[PDB]
Amino acid sequence: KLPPRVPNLIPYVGSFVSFAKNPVQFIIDNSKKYGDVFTATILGKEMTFLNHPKILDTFFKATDNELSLRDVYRFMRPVFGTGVVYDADSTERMMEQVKFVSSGLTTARFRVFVDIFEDEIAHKVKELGPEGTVDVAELMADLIIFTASRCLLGDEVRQYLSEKNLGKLYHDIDDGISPLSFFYPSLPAPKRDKARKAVGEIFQELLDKRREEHKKHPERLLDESKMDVVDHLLTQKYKDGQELTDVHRIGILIAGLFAGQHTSSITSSWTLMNVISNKKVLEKVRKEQEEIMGSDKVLDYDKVMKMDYLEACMKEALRMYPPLIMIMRMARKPRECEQYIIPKGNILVVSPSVAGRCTDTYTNPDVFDPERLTERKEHEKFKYGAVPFGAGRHKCIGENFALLQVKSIISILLRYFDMEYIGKIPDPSYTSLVVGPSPPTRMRYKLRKQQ
Ligand code: HEM
Ligand SMILES: O=C(O[C@H](Cn1ccnc1)c1ccc(F)cc1)c1cccc(C(F)(F)F)c1
Ligand SMILES: [Ca+2]
Ligand SMILES: [Ca+2]
């Protein structure tokens, strides 16, 4: 009736050691032994892993008082803020907060975002010069610090990045966020907290400055192309009529930036590496770019919307290396799954990493092959065969922005540079909450138009 159990190495600690070594491998290996659904004790928590696409409907379609996100992701509170997101008072409030971020991700904004990407890359090529080598992961992270910040927060953020070290503060917050916090939400992190307080004061200042810029220039509020998330946060209230606190606005912006940065810079790195290392894929990608660009010299939104093959490359990098390797929920009530009952209080776990390598969905899954998606449609074999952006009620609302961001960056970089990857494509490093490539990730580059 209860699922089969991974027997423990030890009491309490349970299966932590082999989970911690490689959680993707742990789920695959134990799926073989115990099947589609099994339970492991891990640092005191009962974690029930759901391991096949076919059984996932009841996970994704549940409501929040059956499968709770707030119960598992509340540990983010020292980063995102008290009363924000997974520490909101209710599901309903969290959902309204999400809608404030999504309201800055409009079509009108997306046309302006493409210019932001052009402008930031143009600054960055001054650092890279006409040739050299660079770490792919760092390049992407550094570009996306600037692009995400300006997209979500407005161009007024830029001078804080260039003159007040805001990008270093982001790294200190991000250095302090540990997967083990999920198990111990009180692990102190004094450096993290100091930087979070510092980011708070900067964003408070930015909110204050914007209120006076709204007084002095009220027509800004009538221009859908100039309205960002800070603007919406300052001018909207909750449905029931309660106004937002500056605490909340700050927390929401910080969570917005967290979501707008990590997953995108990781996916860009894996996408670009696999594109430049595969001659056939690079040819197709460049032939699509040349066809879409024609005689124009800069991107725009409509162009990025036609870049289908490159989008398939990004999707194929998301199958193979999803930056969010595990999706969780707590069972607030018992749950049926196949023939089993999953107890109240268990954590249900679905893994986009395991799904992406499932040989029942994908043929030769260790190979990067975007045609598996465009021509073989392998993803469409199960409803939940591809879940890098999740599914159902909590499906990623940043998806179109992330597509826009990564396609644009890669398109622009391929315009400026020939690029070759150094060495073998690395494995994922399971050292961080958002999972990325094991360093080093270096490439050579050379400008295509020298003078
Ligand atoms: C390639 C980039 C990205 C990936 C792979 C990604 C992945 C995911 C996944 C897997 C989920 C489902 C989580 C769950 O069910 O618990 C999700 C939800 C979400 N993502 Fe993303 N995301 C990306 C970019 C973004 C961006 C750029 C934003 C916002 C600017 C964003 C905002 C969200 C939000 C708000 C949710 C909803 C979570 C909830 O309802 O509790 N994401 N994303
Ligand atoms: O950053 C967020 O979630 C990340 C996962 N993620 C990134 C991109 N798409 C989803 C997250 C979720 C749970 C957790 F424990 C740590 C980080 C996030 C989630 C809900 C709402 C928001 C928002 F809208 F910014 F307030 C951000
Ligand atoms: Ca173990
Ligand atoms: Ca799974």
Residue numbers in the entry: 35 to 485
Show sentences the authors wrote.
The amoebicidal effect of CYP51 inhibitors is due to inhibition of 14-demethylation of the endogenous CYP51 substrate in N. fowleri, 31-norlanosterol. 14-Demethylation of 31-norlanosterol is a prerequisite for subsequent 4α-demethylation and 24-methylation steps, leading to biosynthesis of essential ergosterol and ergosterol-like sterols. Depletion of ergosterol, concomitant with the accumulation of intermediates and end-products incompatible with normal permeability and fluidity of the Naegleria cell membrane, leads to the altered morphology and death of N. fowleri cells.
The top hit (2a) had a miconazole-like scaffold (1) and was singled out following cocrystallization with the NfCYP51 target. Only one compound, 2a (used as a racemic mixture), produced cocrystals with the target. Superimposition with fluconazole indicates that both molecules coordinate to the heme iron with the azole moiety, while other aromatic moieties of each compound are engaged in different sets of drug–target interactions. The aromatic nitrogen atom of the imidazole moiety provided a coordination bond to the heme iron. The C2–C3 edge of the 4-fluorophenyl moiety faces heme propionate (6.3 Å) and the OH-groups of Tyr107 (5.3 Å) and Tyr120.
